[PDB]
């Protein structure tokens, strides 16, 4: 239970690419919080919400 309150995940900047008519690629920077033990990127999932999707 200490590991759950200790760890975290900190977003620090989002960029996007364009060049035909509209944005079509997103780049997200990322860095762990300074108490996290071991973040494993094989099982982290991203949700997005747009246009009823």
């Amino acid at each position: 239970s200490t590991e759950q309150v200790a760890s975290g995940l900190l977003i620090n900047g989002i960029t996007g690419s364009v060049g035909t008519s509209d944005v079509k690629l997103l780049a997200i920077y990322l860095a762990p919080n300074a108490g996290s033990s071991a973040i494993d990127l094989a099982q982290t999932k991203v949700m997005l919400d747009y246009n009823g999707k």
Binding site: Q4, L9, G13, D22, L25, A27, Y29, L30, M47
Partner: protein, 52 residues
């Protein structure tokens, strides 16, 4: 320091126009999530636009 790349055109089947507002979360296995908010600007000028 790790960057992520997501394609939008082939995952939303369309585009992402201006003056929109999108949320989202990046839930790890057991930690605390980071929250996303990238409310778009009202004009596209260059070939590489900042969002947050």
């Amino acid at each position: 320091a790790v960057a992520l790349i997501v394609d939008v055109n082939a995952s939303f089947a369309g585009e992402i126009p201006e003056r929109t507002a999108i949320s989202g979360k990046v839930q790890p296995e057991f930690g605390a999530p980071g929250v996303i908010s990238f409310t778009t600007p009202a004009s596209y000028t260059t070939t590489l636009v900042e969002l947050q």
